[model samples]
Target: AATGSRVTVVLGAQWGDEGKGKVVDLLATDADIVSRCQGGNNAGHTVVVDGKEYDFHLLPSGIINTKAVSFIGNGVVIHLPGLFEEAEKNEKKGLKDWEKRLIISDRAHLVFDFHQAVDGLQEVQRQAQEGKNIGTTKKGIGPTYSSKAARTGLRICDLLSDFDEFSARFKNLAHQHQSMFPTLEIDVEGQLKRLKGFAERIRPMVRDGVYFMYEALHGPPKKVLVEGANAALLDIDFGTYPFVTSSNCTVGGVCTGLGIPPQNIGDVYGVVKAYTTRVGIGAFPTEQINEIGDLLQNRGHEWGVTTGRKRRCGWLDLMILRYAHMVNGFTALALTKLDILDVLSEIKVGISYKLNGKRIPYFPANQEILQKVEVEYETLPGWKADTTGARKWEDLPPQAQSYVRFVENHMGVAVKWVGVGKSRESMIQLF
Candidate 1:
């Protein structure tokens, strides 16, 4: 599990937006190939290069490391606007030959503007009545997956080969959607016309990434890095349901998303925040819901980069972090946002959750049980110091160092690295 010439996978250990940008970008420089498995432009990564910051929603963080070839796997749902917007921004910032370095999977599903509108409309209905939404980015991720299931989905390959026929299929679905909204207005021609522009430009980057991955793994001796979207807790099948993201966010998703076989997967690197923060809706047993939560929110800047929603903050949840390791079988961990906790005079961590006076063995997906369970907490002394200047594990305050060790001991995974600040240079090497 130590640093070596080998394949690696990186995923969020908490919920989505778990500072994957920092971890993945750090690893990308050594990676020969970097691929995104699932999710869509719904997630955002803010990466720093040469002290310059770039926010990416569609492109992989590794794209900044031009040495690495990047792919948007078939599992991703693409929004052309977000894609072009990012590409254009990167190009303007002087990213050399970005079109050459970036590749979109031909099998990936397309998420048009209609999907975003539909997603927003659905959230509006929920918020109007429930006073809360499912906590989506309203980027049309769920609806795109819905369309995929309904067999009315459009793929990047479809656009390249025969959009004419796809247009007919699109109209049928659009009309059905209009019936549901009744007042829904869409520039059907305008949207389709825009696609022509994207189609012309993105055509060069689109490819059968499945074959590409297979060849990269089997043919040439290359280092492959699979970047996971969202977190294991948001996985569609394994995560908390009804309130979870649409796709599988766990390690297994990488195989399905990129067409990489289970046999070829390696070094599943787990990334987690120092404390817990969940965006959108779900049962969070450790949420401070008080001054502690407010303090972390402000100190951590706990806001969604993609959705701009305030993240609900809480203490570290080892039980949930353990669950992520249990599901993904973490080989190594990249612990981030440690500096955010430096302001605390006290630290609390969740060890286990008891339901109906009995301890639950695993992370429960059932909403009712999760809501009723009581979290068992462990308190630790805080290290209120400027941790951002630390360069190595030894440089950290003993209390700060103890906190990191505690997490490593609990997860049963070595803490290979830690993120003390948002910048790429702020990482302290522990391994």
Candidate 2:
């Protein structure tokens, strides 16, 4: 069934970790459905609700709200253990009936335990060979995708319905994977046993998600709040390849992940940090790497919610943001961690990139070219005034206002929301 352009997608504008969880948490309250469109347990979201913090790995950020329907789309690769772990946590928090509202696509891939072990093994091997380190979360993401490509992967529906067949095939696949990485061996029997236990428990959440989305579109036109896992720069094709994630994190991904046509998606809202930050290893044209970088990291608390790895900090890079806009076609922007910049006396924005004494008009995908591109900066007076607890745009200092306006003007998209703090109520809308 065809869907109307009624879906609102919330994803990152930069590398992942641009405060998407908080934004999705806020937007979910008004949404009828919140669906996770790509990635798996590899992606993370930490949301603070009512003075209690909730961390989500496989589940959508909307799961914390209990107001919106949560969906795990077909594009995701599921790690059953991780999904069960998250489910337990939610159940303890009075979401025991979460399965009633949660929808897991039967077509989604299964990320087995051997996949996790393979992820660890691959990363070690990549580090041994220079320039191949993907710096993955080691959550069985890459290996699971590899299985998908090899046409030997198990889907949720197959796993639940044809348990014996799925088990035999998975064992052969696991042993084959283990044989390749002889140095590291996985307990295939143990993983298989655990998967069976979870298969029965999680069977209730599995369904024909394509039909679910179709009905949501055709019957009443549900207000879908689609959330992406990784950001644009980590998208396999559109992003800096070889160094990017194994999945598509751009707008095209939403269509495939959710089983919806391009016309079904609308109002793609991009969440971006006021400054730049990247978790994994890759080209960062504007990395500060000095006292200023330290300042941004400490003040903004720029640490990965999933890995706890300190993010590489830098000034705002419009080149990357423009690329995000181009690939994702963002309708509006959510500027996050604006208050982190309030402590500084001045702020810098990368207006352009120069390579070999020439201005590069586009985001270069080549690793060498991206590594060598120099950032051209423009300094602006900082809004040293504290923006914490700000409820409206008028509450911001003039310099802060100027900074926001500059970004909106440069990106050619309106800054619809500004995040001044880390709480659920920390955002303010701007017209």
Candidate 3:
């Protein structure tokens, strides 16, 4: 038997906003099939192609490739209304005939409107009770994942299978939520009518995800790509504690999320921003609260694509990169937004973390230690010139080249692509 195809994965190595969509768009052009594994509409990816910027939430960014088939795997939860809304918005932006090439897993859980209502209600409760809330996108991602875990969630297969039975179960689930959050209101009949319409529309694209992946893997020598949503530091199990996203979002997630074995997985490209940025609140060891942070925030446009909240900026924390590497075992790296550092006289990278005045061997798992840890930064001379216009490895100034090499040497991984700007042509490929 042949091993058929090896899937290449592009994942966010930092705390997201690492320009993974650009990396995926670069690889997706040559791919036969591009897939999304985890997260719901809470995951936001912006892909710029042909001078048009397309925002993707539930739809795979690779859907832009007319020659390629796009997949949504079982690990993802579907918000039907959000899915259609995203598609409708992008359809006007030059996504032609997306429904024809898209394949969704029937097993993917549904993110109901009630779940979204409950998500907001829970956040409000947290704000009142605990005085601090886990900053979420309020897209019902956590609540949906919670429902999936609790076995109360409904899937696409359930919706498409028996309408009467599905409606009954849906009402039960809504009743359960209303009990938990007594203030919650669910338009059960109205929601069901809307869902019925969605079911008819999406039925054509539905397939058994596991069987589809198996056939795709065993069939031919196809270039398969898996686009990972979220980032390494946002994984539920491995990320920064209770503040992290619900899904895995790491290399392991590619396997579990897609129902594919580890051996079928090939190159894992970790996408990293030149400077780190995280939305909402968390323990950021290298967080810059001064003018430096302000500069990066302004220059890089460090607002979240989904939440629109201003991101907390900082120096490139190699400690987190190394920690993410330990978890992801990255094959190579895609260093993006390098030109954002062109104005700095001295650029700093946090190479290590010191806890209680002693260098810690590992990234702290506890928030208390993480917040208190002092960062040890290595300052590199900035190139002090624009790199956005440069399209080749040789075209870059030596100082900027040195910075890329520094990141490579520190991580023990090769720098495969350096992004200078937003366009596809701006991604400089290095062998």
Candidate 4:
């Protein structure tokens, strides 16, 4: 049962925007194989290379490193059209050779065009009914995941068998959905026709991903890196329920998503921003609706890489970070976007949550309690020094060093990597 290789899991410890792409790119040098374990195109990984930025929704961040073999596991909902379009875009960007570095699991589900339509329709319904919209990318991620859970979903292997049969099945499913949305006025037939085109475009790239990964893991002394989308706080089951993502976003998802064994996992690296930020709609305790929040927003370019929606910015939430660390069994931490805090003379880190006059050290399970929880912050002196281009950890300003140390000591996690700026080389390893 002892494998001669290590498996490092990289997940978002906060509400995402944890600079996971940069972390993956940095670690890819040591990784022989890199895999995306969960979520779908709804999540975005932005990698900056030589001042040019690449926003990846489905592709593994390790694709930038040519030697690392990349795999998209079964936990992902493959959006064929989006994947192909992303490939085409990267190709135009002189990354045509990158295709050779990627492999996808055959067991991965396909995100049909109808799924997107269904997502939009459902969101519209929810907004109309609840008067509160779940800030979804409307990328059909929810619908596709729902289908997978319903045991009625189609897989990539399903497309390889018979196109006619697949199309018929899709039509049947579409009619069933159409019946559910009697009040919504949308063209279901047009959606189906467009989805059919997507199916055709994706047919060639479909392969048996599970077999490929299983064989690769057992074959060589290759180290595999499992990358996750979204943060743990947005996980459907463990995260803030109802407002969370549709799938598991934890380290455990790697095995179920890829059909791998628990013994294969080696280390879990949880990526977190120096501060915290959340995109879309959710309960953010330390949300800054004032000037400080605006400062973090503009400095960090806190916008969704996929939707361009502005992210809710706040101080570092240690309580949630500890919660994520506990769930992921995080062995190390990659703290990114530290330079974004340079302008502030003082910085605050949320240590605990106070709900109904009771101090809650951990995130509350009840949604109502979470919504009403007041953040207890411990203010620290900010570095206020521009750390852009500082390669060595020792070269960082004293206050910057203190801030990182404070977070590590208080949160009970080690800060192994610090990202000062946007470029790939902006990362500093503390060791």
Number of the top candidate by lDDT? Answer: 3
lDDT per model vs. reference: 0.83, 0.85, 0.90, 0.79
How would you encode candidate 4's per-residue C-alpha lDDT over 4-91 as one tens digit per residue? 4657888889877788877777778778887888863356666666556666778887777777787788888887878878878876
> For residues 1-431, could you state the per-residue lDDT of candidate 1 as single tens digits?
22223457888887766788677777788898887889733566666667576777777878887788988899999989888887888777766688899888899999988888988888777687857656465688988998999988889998888888877877887887788777677888888889878888889998898887777777647888878888878888877777778998888898889887667877888888898988766788899899999998998888865456789999899888988888899889888989998888889999999988889878887888787889998999999899999888888998999999999998899988888997778998887
**Regions of model 3 farther than 4 Å from truth:** 50-52, 128-130, 305-308
Clashing pairs in 4: 105-209, 106-209
Alpha-carbon deviation at 195 in model 1, angstroms: 2.3
Q: How would the candidate models be sorted by lDDT, starting from the highest? A: 3, 2, 1, 4
Question: Estimated TM-score per prediction?
Answer: 0.92, 0.94, 0.96, 0.90
Candidate 3, residues 344-385: lDDT per residue as tens digits?
Answer: 999999999998889998998988879999999999999999
Q: What's the residue-level lDDT of 153 in candidate 1?
A: 84
Off by over 4 Å in 2: 1-5, 128-132, 184-186, 305-308
